[PDB]
Amino acid sequence: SGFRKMAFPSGKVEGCMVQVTCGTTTLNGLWLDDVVYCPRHVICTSEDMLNPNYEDLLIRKSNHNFLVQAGNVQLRVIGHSMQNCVLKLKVDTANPKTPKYKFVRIQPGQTFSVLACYNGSPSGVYQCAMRPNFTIKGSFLNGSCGSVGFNIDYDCVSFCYMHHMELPTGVHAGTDLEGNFYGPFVDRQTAQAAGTDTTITVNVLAWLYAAVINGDRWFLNRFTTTLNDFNLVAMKYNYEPLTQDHVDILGPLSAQTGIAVLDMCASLKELLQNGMNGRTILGSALLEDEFTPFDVVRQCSGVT
């Protein structure tokens, strides 16, 4: 019973967080095997961050200029290199707590857990969606950069996100662990536009199925629709167009509940056109789009 925004257990990832310091700048690094990964802007003074030439800034830096601290202890840096927007610091000690892991570039609409860190210490854990405009709605202060996003598949950690910055809308942008930004963002202090924040339609539908599984069914109506008809209404509300692959992804939830995907679409259409009329679904007064179909199945079946 009940449906909550739920992070993965963070223990495997807590054991990989270190502190990386250059000059005055301290942020978080991810220690996997004998490599520490961190945002390249660790090398920047406050002057530099307006229009930094990272190649020129890095050339002034040697191995000994990077202080890497794993709790109590100082790691010895024996090599450094820049890959896109991340620094790879080679250290003389393999992290003995290195979990089984992969680096994955996650797709828009997929979710992951953020372990928010400061000075290489965990602050807290929460779920985020990689939004269609390649932003996330996180909670990040100064010193949070290098905090990572991950998924767990049994014992394997899939790292998909490293935190680099805030946009003027109060949303967040970062890189995969190869240092390639999600979306059109760059690591300098300029006003940067994410575009239209489109709603993840397949996730809203997944969450309406979550609501029906959990006994909230007041919004189920007597109508059906077509993909082309629904999409006309999606377009108006800045919803992602629903496609046959999305209908296929929702098939197991459609089956478990006996509500056809296009019947749920008709329900969604009436909610978009009529609002909630002061009513709530799973204790929310708006349509939630940060649960994937997998998140709904995982949570409603107790996957561990």
Ligand X SMILES: *[C@H](O)[C@H](C[C@@H]1CCNC1=O)NC(=O)[C@@H]1[C@H]2CCC[C@H]2CN1C(=O)OCc1ccccc1
CA 129 to chain centre: 5
The contacts of residue 207 (CB under 8 Å, 6+ apart) are: 3, 281, 282, 287, 288, 289, 291, 296
The DSSP 8-state label assigned to residue 93 in this structure reads S
Residues 119-148 that bind ligand X (CB under 6 A): 140-145
Residue count at the site for a second copy (CB under 8 A)?
53
The DSSP 8-state label assigned to residue 41 in this structure reads G
- Indicate the pairing of strand 156-166 with strand 101-103: parallel
Burial 29-57 (b: 16+ CB within 10 A, else e): bbbbebbbbbbbbbbbeeebeeebebeeb
Among 163, 172, 246, 269, binds a second copy (CB under 8 A): 172
**Shortest Å, Cβ 40 to ligand X:** 9
Q: Confirm or reject binding of residue 1 to ligand X (CB under 6 A).
A: yes
Nearer to ligand X, 192 or 224 (CB): 192
CB 69 within 8 A of CB 19: yes
Secondary structure (3-state) at 272: helix
Among 172, 179, 198, 269, binds ligand X (CB under 6 A): 172
Q: Confirm or reject binding of residue 247 to a second copy (CB under 8 A).
A: no
Binding mask 129-168 for a second copy (x = CB under 8 A): --------xxxxxxxx---------------------x--
**Shortest Å, Cβ 126 to ligand X:** 14
Among 99, 108, 122, 241, binds a second copy (CB under 8 A): 122
Respond yes or no: is residue 164 known to be catalytic: no
- Out of 16, 22, 38, 41, the active site residue is 41
List the catalytic residues.
41, 145
Which residues sit at the interface with ligand X, rule CB under 6 A?
1, 27, 41, 49, 140-145, 164-166, 168, 172, 187-191
